[model samples]
Target: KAVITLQPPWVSVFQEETVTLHCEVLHLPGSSSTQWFLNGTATQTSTPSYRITSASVNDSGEYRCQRGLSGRSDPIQLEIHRGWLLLQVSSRVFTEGEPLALRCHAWKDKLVYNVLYYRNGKAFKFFHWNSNLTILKTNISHNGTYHCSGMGKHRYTSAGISVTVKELFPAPVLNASVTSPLLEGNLVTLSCETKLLLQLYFSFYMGSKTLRGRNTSSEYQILTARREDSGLYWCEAATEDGNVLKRSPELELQVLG
Candidate 1:
């Protein structure tokens, strides 16, 4: 069996850092020679280990190894982060009411006296010799661009990350094909629209009950609209991960007899 391993399983590194990858062959005797591949292309190294000096963002890619007559090892993804300081987030989009944590890190995990967090170019929060910024509960007001930097004689700042705090689902727009107060027995077409263009599962609802054509496109059709069918209507958009992005505001429908 052929296996490739990184010196530090965490494949993330700061710019100009040194990283080493080793290739090991097990249950195979006399397999002394090995080849390393970066991004699926062979490197010039014939040894069992490869070393990178002053690694940069351009050096980040998939890596693997191959021994004589043995299949190539599984690819290991490597990442080289830029800048002396880095901002890490638990997630870019957070569900309302969920907790979020942001971290400010220095190269090589160096110790810093203080790290300051910012939102929209304003000082938001600070940590004493700690790199963490935690929000126990998130709301729509928390949606904004955020960043962090280290202080204490030496200064290091990281790039910003945009965070969006959406309700269970983002608020969607309810649109009707025609004007409201449609004639009775007229077919009505309603659509749930959102700014999020990601692949989503849309569902239309009348009040709290789900309408027909569940988990379909962003549209819902009423074969024959009746006065009784008119009520508070809304739509829900969700991602495949089961995270509801938004629920639109309730819209009133009036059908005349």
Candidate 2:
């Protein structure tokens, strides 16, 4: 059996940069010439594959190779999607001086160097700019769209990734509860309601540390609660990859005497 696979489905290459296309044939016992195809047209002048000396967006497309032998092989598809650099903020909602982390993700098939991050269409001054952008202590003026592009011997052959910055308030309340003030050693029941069935990770933060009781449900119960669980209580819904998608409003459980 003959098989083919493309390493990357998407690529973000800079202008005038050399990019190599790798092609290999499987289970072919004898030596035979392989034909390469780009966007459904056969490249007559090329061998197993074609390489772009200076890559550009116009050069991007589906690339595949086929053996010239009598046997047929499945066509491999190579989709050259654009590469993007993006900015990530700490939180969607900001108060005044909040830190943020901006990262860049590109195609695994190519090597990208000289990545630059831009804020509000202007170059941000930093101690030493690297592949990722970091913002410490942000304010109102820091709210805007951020962009990342390639800048080096080769210009950007394709557009970069764009990120938007905004000021967000605390998430809206899913549910709330209150009880009359009491004294120490008083028996009380505290219940906080939220939508947690869809969450992959459930965590409660006491301070910077997590209070561990991982349960998947819409309701959380604290039976005969005490003072230790008194600080800020909130529910976080995360993905399997650890991406926080939904955050419930902060609920304060106070034990008074």
Candidate 3:
């Protein structure tokens, strides 16, 4: 199946903004030109990417694409808004620990200043000059409806947009099969436990060193657990695609000499 994606990875844009829709067909290389569709009608454009140099309100619609035997892609909406003030977000998906960026823009480069960004009616930040807002690390608590108001010839408030933060994987638990006070030279097995359904991989860490790299299995082994093997240990779970990673609290292990 073809995967339809948007450049800048956003679903909404302001009037005259540019966007590109890409039809990515996995492993199907050197094929014929791509077929583009808009609102269930053929666009007659034979390119893998459909670029809208400038979008108007009429450009809002559902988009899809296909090529060769890869099949058609899923329909995705592209919304264009017409307003004196516009609010822009960096992406459609917001994951934990990632940066979230937003912009408050005035239409046609109109001179607007003294911007104040708001969420759920309460003002979050005020800018003397119009500038972008960035969250260093995003979490679920950041999700809400957001908008911006600024001073133009008069006052302008941008349209509001809702955002949701997602967790790729939950924190995992690191457990040792044996007791914390272990005999020297004894074998110890540690397992990283998470509610993973055979899709997520695990990584093990001892102190500041990596004991195990990413793997589908959950266990890390100490062939001869010595007194030096005692330390703080932790584990993380991630998607096999290496996209998402979540870590658990540290576990203390002690070995008896």
TM-score of 1: 0.52
Error of 2 at 91 (Å): 22
Residues 10-81, candidate 1: write the lDDT tens digits. 355678877788888776744658788888789889877788888877788888888876678877667778
The C-alpha lDDT values of all candidates are: 0.76, 0.49, 0.82
TM-score against truth, every candidate: 0.52, 0.42, 0.66
Candidate 3 residue-wise lDDT, 101-211, digit = tens: 888878887887899999888998999999989987776667788899999998989888887777655578888989787789888888998873328889899889999
User: Which stretches of candidate 3 lie above 4 Å from their native place?
Assistant: 1-10, 16-35, 39-58, 68-70, 93-101, 114-128, 132-146, 153-155, 163-166, 178-187, 195-201, 209-217, 222-231, 238-244, 254-257
Candidate 2, residue 64: Cα displacement in angstroms equals 9.0
Give per-model CA RMSD.
7.7, 10.6, 4.8
How far is 167's C-alpha from truth in model 2 (Å)? 17
Is candidate 1 or 2 superior in TM-score?
A: 1
Which residue runs does candidate 2 get wrong by more than 4 Å? 1-15, 21-50, 60-116, 120-174, 177-199, 206-211, 225-230, 241-249, 255-257
Report the lDDT of model 3 for residue 32: 58
